[model samples]
Target: NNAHVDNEFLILQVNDAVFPIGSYTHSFGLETYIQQKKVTNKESALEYLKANLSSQFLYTEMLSLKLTYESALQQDLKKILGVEEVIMLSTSPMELRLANQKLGNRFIKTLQAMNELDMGEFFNAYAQKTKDPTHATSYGVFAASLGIELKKALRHYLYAQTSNMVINCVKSVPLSQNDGQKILLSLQSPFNQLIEKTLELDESHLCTA
Candidate 1:
């Protein structure tokens, strides 16, 4: 099997900067910070990015992905659907649900066209079984279905999400391009640490933060 070569290109293609996921319009509440005069400068923008990666994304999205990834390893659609129920409960409490599902729907659509691997009936079954699972869910399951290792997948997802957040900071906070990338580069260590923590976590720990 050329699974290795296939996976390498597949990962790059799916996560490409121009994936058309429409997440460009979603800020995950950063917009509120901008409007309230809370995140006005580069240093404060860095602080906001720190909080989002360390506190919010660490607890919520990564944990959700961890659950779905492991469940996917087992090919457990029922378990994934259980994760979906939790996703619905957790998603409804915020505006993030709207943003997440929009990106997620686009994710499913794009992957349906892009992912041509032999993942049995799992991918089709998953698509038909669930409704409005978050982009986080789709990412984890899709990565696992493609035979990608979990840590690498999580690393890429966190990097992309953080990078997107940095771009928004550049546009909304009106920071210089260099400072925005500076903030993005500063996140590597934090992303590494968070991914480690995510591996150590289980369903019991999901959304507990």
Candidate 2:
């Protein structure tokens, strides 16, 4: 019971908005959409968030997270690196790709500072050896190292991604603070449903670009 609580505590710490992984600086391209009037209000911002969660993130980053966590469970460093490579290639938009890599580097550094040896060493070496991007898969491995279940980690990851974008929308779209909270509230059910679906996926069903 104490172990479970400790794992949950670790998840909360890493997922905290102020953890300094640079999630706030990147809009994941929502800023461009807002500037072009594609996501100028609460309704459109909600649609944008839903579309991004469904289309881009669910299969790509979230699936990579699951795969990486499974690999970490088996201590299969090769499989983890393979999953990371697949995710790096799958991410489009040069700017978003760069942001993912930067966030990944920072994630590794922070974990190392916290003395998270398993994931920190593996990720740091992988990044240096291959000159590849860690992306969100690093977080998956880190969560696995902390003994967090895959479903719970994935849920937090998706929530963080969605909320970060929502916050970006709040600032860029200039939505009322209440509306931002409403957006998150409306997404809860869909996010939970997506998590159910995501938990069933395997390598054969993963997204690739």
User: Total clashes, candidate 1?
Assistant: 0
Point out the worst 10-residue segment of candidate 1 by lDDT. Answer: 112-121
Top candidate (TM-score): 1
TM-score of model 1 (CA atoms) = 0.90
- TM-score for each model: 0.90, 0.85
Candidate 2 off by > 4 Å: 1-5, 24-26, 116-135
User: lDDT by residue for model 2 over 1-209, one digit each (tens)?
Assistant: 23234665778888888787775434656768977889878999889888887765777777778888788778788887777677667667777677778877787777667643445455455545433445467887777766777788888888887888888889888999999999999999999988887788777666641
Give Cα-based local distance difference scores for all models.
0.78, 0.74
Which candidate number would show the highest lDDT if scored against the true structure?
A: 1
